[PDB]
């Protein structure tokens, strides 16, 4: 079978980004030893090791949706993958508010309505499970108390 490739964006500190960029544009396999990525079983934490120097990483969710588009003639472009995650290196914390491009900054707060909200469904399911595992349930919409 075929499995869709999973592309994400890696953001590095600027000096380490310059060393990684020089090693990528050089093209030797020396870069392969120099740059490693260890993703922790949290799923939202990692180390990126540049030249064997550990950097602390967080895999965050991006507010917009990016799409990689490949081409052979620079006139027709074929969509290859969807990018929604970034492993910035240096829950609410794992959500990035800004977009990658310069015009998209504070996009989630200003150029996007917070329609993402309505977690709550999971809590409701847990409450239903507790009621099922119970015997008698008493409910009242309340006031200030």
């Amino acid at each position: 079978p075929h499995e869709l490739e999973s592309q994400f964006i890696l953001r590095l500190p600027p000096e380490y980004a310059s060393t990684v960029r020089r090693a990528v544009q050089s093209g030797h396999v020396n870069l392969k030893d120099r740059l490693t990525i260890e993703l922790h079983p949290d799923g939202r934490h990692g180390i990126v090791r540049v030249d064997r120097v550990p950097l602390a990483s967080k895999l965050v969710d991006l507010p917009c949706v990016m799409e990689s588009l490949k081409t052979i003639d620079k006139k027709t472009f074929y969509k290859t993958a969807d990018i929604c995650q970034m492993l910035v290196s240096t829950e609410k914390k794992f959500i990035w508010n800004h977009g990658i491009t310069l015009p998209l900054k504070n996009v989630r707060k200003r150029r996007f309505r917070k329609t993402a909200k309505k977690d709550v469904e999971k809590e409701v399911k847990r409450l239903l499970s507790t009621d099922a595992e119970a015997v008698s349930t008493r409910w009242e919409i309340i006031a200030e108390d």
Partner: protein, 56 residues
């Protein structure tokens, strides 16, 4: 955060409180009173309860 209108705990300004009766190991009959301070989850629970009542 960009200034936005802040909604009240629902139109009614009413929270949801649930009392649960369960049996512990050996012999016991403890009762748990749990108050939902979130309208979203509370509204979803109320809708589910109404659907269950109709389902009869």
């Amino acid at each position: 955060t960009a200034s936005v209108t802040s909604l009240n705990s629902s139109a009614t300004g009413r929270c949801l409180k649930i009392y649960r009766t369960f049996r512990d190991e050996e012999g016991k009959e403890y009762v748990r009173c749990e108050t939902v301070r979130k309208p979203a989850v509370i509204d979803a629970y109320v809708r589910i309860r109404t659907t269950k009542d109709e389902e009869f």
